[PDB]
Write an enzyme that holds these catalytic residues in place. Structure first.
Site, PDB file in Angstrom:
ATOM      1  CG  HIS A   1      -2.023  -0.918   1.209  1.00 48.99           C
ATOM      2  ND1 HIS A   1      -3.092  -0.757   0.355  1.00 48.99           N
ATOM      3  CD2 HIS A   1      -2.265  -2.050   1.912  1.00 48.99           C
ATOM      4  CE1 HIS A   1      -3.943  -1.753   0.533  1.00 48.99           C
ATOM      5  NE2 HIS A   1      -3.467  -2.548   1.475  1.00 48.99           N
TER       6      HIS A   1
ATOM      7  CB  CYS B   1      -2.869  -0.419  -3.382  1.00 47.34           C
ATOM      8  SG  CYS B   1      -2.532  -1.876  -4.447  1.00 47.34           S
TER       9      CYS B   1
END
Ligand SMILES: O=C(CSc1ccccc1C(=O)O)c1ccc(Cl)cc1
Lengths: 210, 201
Positions: B88, B130
């Protein structure tokens, strides 16, 4: 040497290579605390002669304010680029993280380049939009930024980045791909003069100026 | 003359950091498909000739240590170094399982002054979220749970067929186009390389 596979290159079969705006900022208002950028005129003369030889329609602006820089670039994006293979902009000024100086003050580099986004400049869509920045210390496909420093300038000789770029472009501007040219410029600033230039590429194809 | 010298006994080490599950204290969701990504990345970089090692669910401390150890190894017999980060992320920062860490920290270990045995050799970082010369960053950012990310599918498909005959920028530019046209989002290549990089000869 490498081959040239035509569906991997940017289509250069257009009436014109494209526009090449050069913003040459040398003198700044006292209130900014920024000083005269000695050597920038040498850089601007060498870059305009260089990009003219490549086939660009170069325009050279000088000592621009922030509103002017925004206006000329917004208007340049509202022109019709249908007949051009690409576009190029060269900023010569003071700068700081994410911002470039005008003579009155400061403006985000992202705001200047946004005008040429696909959804705001439909006639440059799918065409490379080059931005070369010498700043003294998908809607984004087809952009490419060459920053002078991840910056030095010889007051009598010009900035190192510009000198190196122009030299490489004269000898190979029509036979090397853009990344090969900028990589050689990276090596020249690093070895021939410390400093390291920075290329950010969002390009989707190989770019050859011929 | 204009290419990075590849006459070395090893292509180099390739560290793949695969963060799929984050601690409930971080509040990041399970990244389904990153194992599909990682397995593919593992074959590609292994075919290119990297000595690949996959680490799952690292933490900011583990990652920083993992990279520091790699930077403290002896790369004399290596052409380059690659590190792939699947995780992430936010602006200027990557997510560990325990929190966030700035990408600048993970790369700082390999700067010319701290990893002399890799000096003048390319250090490649691939981030799917992400002194500074000879670094190259390929940034991601959307991913489909059952098939993997667009960026990784493209990067592996290109490298399988052209990894040995195209320069890094040609490969990455083809990935840029593949991602732009098959899915919008465009990856982003940041290059401070001083030569052309070919994974061969
Ligand atoms: O390189 C830029 C210009 S943003 C941009 C980035 C990639 C592609 C197109 C643009 C574009 O819209 O022109 C930048 C990015 C982040 C920050 Cl914080 C400041 C500048």
């Amino acid at each position: 040497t490498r081959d040239r596979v035509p569906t991997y290159q940017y289509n250069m079969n257009f009436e014109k290579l494209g526009k090449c705006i050069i913003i040459n900022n040398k003198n700044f208002d006292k209130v900014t605390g920024m000083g005269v950028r000695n050597g920038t005129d040498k850089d601007a003369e060498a870059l305009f002669k260089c990009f003219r030889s490549l086939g660009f329609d170069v325009i050279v602006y000088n000592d621009c304010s922030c509103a002017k820089m925004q206006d000329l670039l917004k208007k340049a994006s509202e022109e019709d680029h249908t007949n051009a293979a690409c576009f190029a902009c060269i900023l010569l000024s003071h700068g700081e993280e994410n911002v470039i100086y005008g003579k009155d003050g400061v403006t985000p580099i992202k705001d200047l380049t946004a005008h040429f986004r696909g959804d705001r400049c439909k006639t440059l869509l799918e065409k490379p939009k080059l931005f070369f920045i010498q700043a003294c210390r998908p809607v984004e496909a087809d952009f490419l930024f060459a920053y002078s420093t991840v910056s030095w300038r010889s007051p009598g000789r010009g900035s190192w980045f510009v000198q190196a770029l122009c030299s490489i472009l004269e000898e190979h501007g029509k036979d090397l791909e853009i990344m090969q040219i900028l990589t050689r410029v990276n090596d020249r600033v690093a070895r021939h003069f410390k400093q390291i230039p920075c290329v950010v590429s969002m390009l989707t194809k190989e770019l050859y100026f011929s």
